Design a protein around this ligand. Sequence first.
Ligand SMILES: COC(=O)/C(O)=C/C(=O)C1(Cc2ccc(Cl)cc2)CCN(Cc2cccc(OC)c2)CC1
Ligand SMILES: [Mn+2]
Ligand SMILES: [Mn+2]
Length: 172
Amino acid sequence: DPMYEQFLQRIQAVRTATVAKDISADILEARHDYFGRELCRALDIEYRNNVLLDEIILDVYPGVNLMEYNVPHVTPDNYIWTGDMLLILDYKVSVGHDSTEVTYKKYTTLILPVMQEIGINTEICIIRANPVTNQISIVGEQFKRLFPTIPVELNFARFFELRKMLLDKFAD
Ligand SMILES: COC(=O)/C(O)=C/C(=O)C1(Cc2ccc(Cl)cc2)CCN(Cc2cccc(OC)c2)CC1
Ligand SMILES: [Mn+2]
Ligand SMILES: [Mn+2]
């Protein structure tokens, strides 16, 4: 399980708050990445983790006249092209929904107008794991209809363990 040991080694060696703050942020991103990976594996969809909208548009519509559109500089985690619809996918791992709503608002305003100009039907979908209860919440109707049952086995304990080691080490 090489992801956990790399963090252990980093926590073993860290001696300053500055590097420690960095390790903490990394664990949280890694915890998000693990959810994204596990979720795509269970739902049997291609795993990606940050894709420029430019490359999404160029995948689903290789003949777009790109220079005619002002495409924003955003990287949603992943996407699904259904054949008829594009689902923008962002993963979230939080005990609450404030972070989910912030991304939802952002991608709604910056992504939907350009995709309407090009004529690709698009839905913003945000999938969030509660890392304590492992409950999964979904924002996005077409996603909901494509994946009615969503019981993805998850275990976030190792990430909580790594971070507790850190805050114990720096508890002063
Ligand atoms: C969970 O949902 C997100 O928050 C998300 O997926 C964020 C990201 O992917 C970034 C890496 C990261 C992921 C999870 C966590 Cl826990 C912490 C960090 C990378 C990109 N970044 C937005 C950004 C910033 C600066 C330039 C830029 O160029 C478009 C884009 C946010 C963090
Ligand atoms: Mn991301
Ligand atoms: Mn994300």
